[PDB]
Amino acid sequence: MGLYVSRLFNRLFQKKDVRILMVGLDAAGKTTILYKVKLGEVVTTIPTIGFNVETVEFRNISFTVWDVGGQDKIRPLWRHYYSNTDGLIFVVDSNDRERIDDAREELHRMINEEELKDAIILVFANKQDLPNAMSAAEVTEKLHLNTIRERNWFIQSTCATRGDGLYEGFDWLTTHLNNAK
Ligand SMILES: Nc1nc2c(ncn2[C@@H]2O[C@H](COP(=O)(O)OP(=O)(O)O)[C@@H](O)[C@H]2O)c(=O)[nH]1
Ligand SMILES: [Mg+2]
Secondary structure, X not given: OHXXXXXXXXXXXXXXXXXXXXXXXXXXXXXXXXXXXXXXXXXXXOOOOOOOEEEEEEOOEEEEEEEOOOOOOOHHHHHHHOOOOOEEEEEEEOOOOOXXXXXHHHHHHHOOOHHHOOOEEEEEEEOOOOOOOOXXXXXXXXXXXXXXXXXXXXXXXXXXXXXXXXXXXXXXXXXXXXXXX
């Protein structure tokens, strides 16, 4: 698993530094995905009391992961990670309808950051395994992804716990990060 996903990134070996942010509300499935793709050690750090960041690095690639939609007064704290971002992965809980609108706002707010203006957008509609989970289509509507313009985005159904859709999602991401600039 980690093997085949690791290969996908060989595509970007020429790139000096591939920066990938992976965000989403808490409990969307971010941490699960990191330990599921086993691309590298999930080094955890605590920049400031209460703010938890997970970092995975391998070769010229790095992932910086943290939860959004928490105490939206800490949002400026996240800016330290926007500069030179090549790709943005937004993980969403497809089964959580109560907070899908919060996800939407965090996402649209985040992709309109001057510094994230040219980042590829990968959306993981996670927890597709759950019975009453919104289909990728309904998550696309709730996240209002069709209102995104001039941006290269893609929504991918996944079950982080089993790994389904991860390879596909990353296959798309790395393919586009490659011919970006
Ligand atoms: N049913 C189901 N649960 C999942 C899936 N992905 C993650 N979870 C669970 O949802 C919770 C999210 O935790 P992670 O630690 O994954 O959360 P996050 O880092 O805050 O997004 C954990 O209880 C996971 O075991 C999935 O595809 N299906
Ligand atoms: Mg987490």
